[PDB]
Amino acid sequence: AQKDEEKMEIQEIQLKEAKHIAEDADRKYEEVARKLVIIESDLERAEERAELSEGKCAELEEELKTVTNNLKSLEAQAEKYS
Amino acid sequence: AQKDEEKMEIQEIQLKEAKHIAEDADRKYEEVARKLVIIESDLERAEERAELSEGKCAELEEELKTVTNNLKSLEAQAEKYS
Amino acid sequence: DDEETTALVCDNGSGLVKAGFAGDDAPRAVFPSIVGRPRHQGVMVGMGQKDSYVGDEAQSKRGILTLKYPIEHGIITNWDDMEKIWHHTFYNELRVAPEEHPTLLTEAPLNPKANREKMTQIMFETFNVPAMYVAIQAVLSLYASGRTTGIVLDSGDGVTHNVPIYEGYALPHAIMRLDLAGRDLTDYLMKILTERGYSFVTTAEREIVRDIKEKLCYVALDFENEMATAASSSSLEKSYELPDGQVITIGNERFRCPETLFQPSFIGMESAGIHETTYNSIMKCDIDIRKDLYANNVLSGGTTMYPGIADRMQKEITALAPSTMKIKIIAPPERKYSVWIGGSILASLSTFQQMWISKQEYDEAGPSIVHRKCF
Amino acid sequence: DDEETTALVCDNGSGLVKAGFAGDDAPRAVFPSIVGRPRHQGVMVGMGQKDSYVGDEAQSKRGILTLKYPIEHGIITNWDDMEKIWHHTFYNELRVAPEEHPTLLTEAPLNPKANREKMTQIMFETFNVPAMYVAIQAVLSLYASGRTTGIVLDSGDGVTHNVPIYEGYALPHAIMRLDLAGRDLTDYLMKILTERGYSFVTTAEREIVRDIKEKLCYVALDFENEMATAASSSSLEKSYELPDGQVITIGNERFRCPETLFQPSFIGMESAGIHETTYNSIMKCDIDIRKDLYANNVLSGGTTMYPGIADRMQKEITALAPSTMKIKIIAPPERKYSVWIGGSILASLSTFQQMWISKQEYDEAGPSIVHRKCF
Amino acid sequence: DDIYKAAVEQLTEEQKNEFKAAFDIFVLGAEDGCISTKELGKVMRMLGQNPTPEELQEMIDEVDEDGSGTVDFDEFLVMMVRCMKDDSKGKSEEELSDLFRMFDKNADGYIDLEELKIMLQATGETITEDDIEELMKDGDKNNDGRIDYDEFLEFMKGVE
Amino acid sequence: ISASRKLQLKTLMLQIAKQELEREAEERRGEKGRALSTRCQPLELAGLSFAELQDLCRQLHARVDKVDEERYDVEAKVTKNITEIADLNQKIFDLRGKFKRPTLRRVRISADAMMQALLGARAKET
Amino acid sequence: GKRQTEREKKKKILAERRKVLAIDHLNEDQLREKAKELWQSIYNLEAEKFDLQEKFKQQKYEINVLRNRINDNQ
Numbered sequence A, B: 001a002q003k004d005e006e007k008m009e010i011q012e013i014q015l016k017e018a019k020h021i022a023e024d025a026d027r028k029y030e031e032v033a034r035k036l037v038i039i040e041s042d043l044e045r046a047e048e049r050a051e052l053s054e055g056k057c058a059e060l061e062e063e064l065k066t067v068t069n070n071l072k073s074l075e076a077q078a079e080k081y082s
Numbered sequence C, D: 001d002d003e004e005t006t007a008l009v010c011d012n013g014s015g016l017v018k019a020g021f022a023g024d025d026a027p028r029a030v031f032p033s034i035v036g037r038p039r040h041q042g043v044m045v046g047m048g049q050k051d052s053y054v055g056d057e058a059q060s061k062r063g064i065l066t067l068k069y070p071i072e073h074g075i076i077t078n079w080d081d082m083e084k085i086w087h088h089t090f091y092n093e094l095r096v097a098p099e100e101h102p103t104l105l106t107e108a109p110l111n112p113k114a115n116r117e118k119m120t121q122i123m124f125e126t127f128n129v130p131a132m133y134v135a136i137q138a139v140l141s142l143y144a145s146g147r148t149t150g151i152v153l154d155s156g157d158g159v160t161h162n163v164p165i166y167e168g169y170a171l172p173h174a175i176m177r178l179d180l181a182g183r184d185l186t187d188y189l190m191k192i193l194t195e196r197g198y199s200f201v202t203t204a205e206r207e208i209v210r211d212i213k214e215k216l217c218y219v220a221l222d223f224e225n226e227m228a229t230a231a232s233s234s235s236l237e238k239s240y241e242l243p244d245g246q247v248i249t250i251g252n253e254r255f256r257c258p259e260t261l262f263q264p265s266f267i268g269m270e271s272a273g274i275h276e277t278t279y280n281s282i283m284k285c286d287i288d289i290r291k292d293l294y295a296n297n298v299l300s301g302g303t304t305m306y307p308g309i310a311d312r313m314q315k316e317i318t319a320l321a322p323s324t325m326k327i328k329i330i331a332p333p334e335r336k337y338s339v340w341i342g343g344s345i346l347a348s349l350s351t352f353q354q355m356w357i358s359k360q361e362y363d364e365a366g367p368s369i370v371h372r373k374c375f
Numbered sequence E: 001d002d003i004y005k006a007a008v009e010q011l012t013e014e015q016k017n018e019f020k021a022a023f024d025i026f027v028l029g030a031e032d033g034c035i036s037t038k039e040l041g042k043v044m045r046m047l048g049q050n051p052t053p054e055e056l057q058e059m060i061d062e063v064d065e066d067g068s069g070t071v072d073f074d075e076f077l078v079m080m081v082r083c084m085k086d087d088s089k090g091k092s093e094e095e096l097s098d099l100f101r102m103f104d105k106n107a108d109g110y111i112d113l114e115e116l117k118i119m120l121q122a123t124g125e126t127i128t129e130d131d132i133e134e135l136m137k138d139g140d141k142n143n144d145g146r147i148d149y150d151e152f153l154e155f156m157k158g159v160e
Numbered sequence F: 001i002s003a004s005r006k007l008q009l010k011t012l013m014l015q016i017a018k019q020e021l022e023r024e025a026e027e028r029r030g031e032k033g034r035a036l037s038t039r040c041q042p043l044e045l046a047g048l049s050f051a052e053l054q055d056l057c058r059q060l061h062a063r064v065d066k067v068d069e070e071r072y073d074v075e076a077k078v079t080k081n082i083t084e085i086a087d088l089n090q091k092i093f094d095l096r097g098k099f100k101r102p103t104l105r106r107v108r109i110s111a112d113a114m115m116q117a118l119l120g121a122r123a124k125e126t
Numbered sequence G: 001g002k003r004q005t006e007r008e009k010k011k012k013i014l015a016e017r018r019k020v021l022a023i024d025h026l027n028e029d030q031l032r033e034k035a036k037e038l039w040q041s042i043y044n045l046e047a048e049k050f051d052l053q054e055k056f057k058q059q060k061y062e063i064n065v066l067r068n069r070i071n072d073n074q
């Protein structure tokens, strides 16, 4: 009976410690999950902005190249006209 | 002694159950923490990409304006020669 | 707008259907003319999967479709699909019921009669329009330039035709229609890309090759010099990113694809290039209007948008033509929609308002009315 | 609930049978699929000793049984035992007679026909269900993610298969089925544990090795660095208490057991790992849907629950794939029951309500009805 | 359960004291009258069941108005009765769609403030402008004065 | 406050909408009956000879054919509108499907049965 | 032959809603009853026309709703 009482006491101590550790871990899980959701939303917005910018830049480059080639041809024709 | 030993057995079962709960919570916590750090790095990368794309867009716009001015000059020259 | 009644200027084309109300500057809705049935099995239930995606919707789901154009060379080979395309154009891209709007289709020169008669029969029976009129695709392109003379080379995607016109009097004996166009250039580009390792076979990948052709290819001013330069330096190799990565590098395939226009022997065609069929079309005209046609050569159609074609063609014709005549090539920046702009201008005219084929006239003479006075 | 009739979403699997009524979040009863006859003699009289303990009852008396799984690799090798498992599942774990409930079994891709036909014949003759339908285990896992595209890697315990799907149209020519799964990892772990002195041989001790694998093993982000670290320090050695004491210490066996997934040469298999069969399955698809499949890679099945696999797989695919595409790996926390959740969603749909194989249809065409339109 | 909550709420608030006594009969040792993760887990393990903490947090957050993560006494009753789900399928989709189509008196595809005001004045039930403002906040999510059909479905989620 | 009064107000609004819809539908049905009665020219079946009856029957059969043609045109228009609205619903499904699927609620395991088992009859909720 | 089917179906409506009608060989009572049948057919056709008008209004409203939903979802 004495040994059983000792075991009961140590079990109670261990149970209390484990429960407190578990509750702390659950609270940390909740907070980190919220943080992850926020940062993921921010990353998605940044990605969509970058994609739009890249598309517009590519289109503008194409337009610039076209008009530049046109100007070069026109200048060559002007020299021939001279 | 017998009654206290039964109580000790119940306490031990509950203790090990709480231990399992704590271990699972710790696993979730560390996993989500690693996810958070990875997503933070990804966000930094995306922002850098967006900045580069914006710079490219600006320079292309300026070059297009220059080429348009050159085109106007060239068309005037061409009609004069005609 | 309000009361009154506006005309629908549709333009079937072959490759891009361009439509819009009469009196504007640009077509309201431009979308590829492809109808693609799905080809795989499909396991998700209730996904709302249709049996045929037409127009621009089938250019986004093209990964699991088998796109097939309903117009081969000007002529229409699959009437059900063409009817589907027209129905889509009227109801979803313009959202105007055809019961309250005249229509102005366009047709290539020298096309089979049955095609035109079936077109008018469909427009009058199925869609039940008030009145429709069919016009030759080159006269409109001459309208858009604001000229009244000139010889117009309308190199579309289906067929390239070259109609000379003087003082408003078309010369029917000098129309030179050639069946080389953008589609054959796409096929030839897809065939010469295999010389580097890139194999495109599926009917969906023909669209990717078309995009490559549009964005990279250009017409060389002098062919042999470019062939020599591309074989020594590497200043021409431009790269392009496929829809999944794996960038490709196009070497001297850049100016060899559109060179087929000036040397149709590349794809095995016998006839002469677009640089010599124009000169032949001019020489069939009378001796006193050749100077005006030389000075007012007009380019139109999509395929004439290659960077550097308005100089190669002028150089070639100047080589062929007598040294005294002045050769001028009109290449407006709005080349692609030139036919439709001309169609809008023609439909907006007051003098033209009594040339429509009214429905009661069709009821009295049948579909063969189109060949009659109302041309 | 009340009137009306609910469907039974059973999911045979191989290793854990998961079942429950349609329309819930989690399976009602999950229990190992093992049937173990006793092997010793038995001297107590009247103890009420049965001749075969199935399900979760044989995981408690496993000390004197010889457990044997009735499903080897997706296919079913012992039909009497499988019938016993189904009977237990219906009558004791759910307590609903099958005479009044439709059933929705699940089957791996590319399985023998005879297995599926025998399954439907059993369900219609022995249990006498009103109507049953067989679905591919990957489409359901795609349902559960709420997507409609994506390539799903469903690494179960019997067989790992990789079905790509786009816009609801499955691609039958790009399914890559590989027979490495959780069971082979258990056997390999049991084989490498012998390098420290621990010998597990009995079919009952395979369960203990499975528990060790579940609780301790993890997938290394980089294999060589982990092999070097575990050979110098001792920060990895985690201990575990057997069902009788005598704790054991697992060293670098922790990340060597699940590494077999990415290097199947460890267990002598020729094929490439799960990191390269996904890329091969993608590359067989068309060139225009590869970006979407890259961005929507889905993980499912039990064996994909190793801590740290969603990063190793992403690193590997990013190494293989072109640098421009974005690689994203969807790893929902409810991975294990993903197939069953998808099955519940599919059975709860109204559009799906007419796809069941009704009993009168089976009576008219025999068991070969399953290969017909009712797939 | 929620309908059972409405039926029970028609009685006295000393029934809340009786509920506290029953909760003690369950898990005697309670000290605050609020149900956190630990107490719910303990009572469910005593019963022989275990819902996940994430599900409990979602259930709590859906009713959380003050954003503190807790519940008041009436909110304690609300959270206690929210532990079961009996509002299934949300009445009917087709009938509600027909009702909303009839609501749009000008047939513009949206529900404006004037239409809702007219309908509320025609209802005859004792109402206040504060409840009208709260309903407008709940219904028109993007504050454009108009309800989308999808916004109509969201505003009618879990409504019998 | 809580959502009990909000739900009561919402149910009251739904009841008022249903009653108004029922009354409007009944009024429209009555007006439709009146209009249909007014449209058709009444029969005059007294004092008409045999030849007059035959002539009037032939004229009314011609009128019936014309009305059949009109109703066929109306039906064809209705069929075209049905096809168009079905295609619009298809496009709605395409643009609004994907991840916009509602889900049921079966994740919560039985709770009242445990309450009755561990409480006898002390739980009267369910 | 969808157009041919349409024309033949219109002819079949002409010859079916109005069968081969021989009102010259019927007695006075039969003629009166057939005239009342034709009048009731007119009534039924008008009723179905009004029903189709109601359906057309409902279809227009639902099409507008779908258009608004499409525009907002983008």
Ligand SMILES: Nc1ncnc2c1ncn2[C@@H]1O[C@H](COP(=O)(O)OP(=O)(O)O)[C@@H](O)[C@H]1O
Pocket: C012, C013, C014, C015, C016, C017, C155, C156, C157, C158, C182, C183, C186, C210, C213, C214, C215, C301, C302, C303, C305, C306, C336
């Ligand atoms: N910017 C461009 N550069 C080169 N080729 C082009 C360009 N745009 C269109 N094309 C070619 O022209 C075709 C479209 O021609 P289009 O004028 O639309 O034909 P249609 O006369 O039938 O309308 C496309 O198939 C494409 O191959």
Ligand SMILES: Nc1ncnc2c1ncn2[C@@H]1O[C@H](COP(=O)(O)OP(=O)(O)O)[C@@H](O)[C@H]1O
Pocket: D012, D013, D014, D015, D016, D017, D155, D156, D157, D158, D182, D183, D186, D210, D213, D214, D215, D301, D302, D303, D305, D306, D336
């Ligand atoms: N938490 C876990 N960690 C690692 N492996 C696991 C875990 N849970 C299950 N497994 C492995 O997955 C298998 C169960 O897979 P499961 O998805 O049930 O297969 P099936 O597809 O036949 O249902 C088990 O045999 C086990 O080896």
Ligand SMILES: [Ca+2]
Pocket: E064, E065, E066, E067, E068, E069, E070, E071, E072, E075
């Ligand atoms: Ca609160």
Ligand SMILES: [Ca+2]
Pocket: E104, E105, E106, E107, E108, E110, E111, E112, E115
């Ligand atoms: Ca309104």
Ligand SMILES: [Ca+2]
Pocket: E140, E141, E142, E143, E144, E145, E146, E147, E148, E151
């Ligand atoms: Ca709104």
Ligand SMILES: [Mg+2]
Pocket: C013, C014, C137, C154, C156, C157, C301, C302, C339
């Ligand atoms: Mg054209």
Ligand SMILES: [Mg+2]
Pocket: D013, D014, D137, D154, D156, D157, D301, D302, D339
């Ligand atoms: Mg499985």
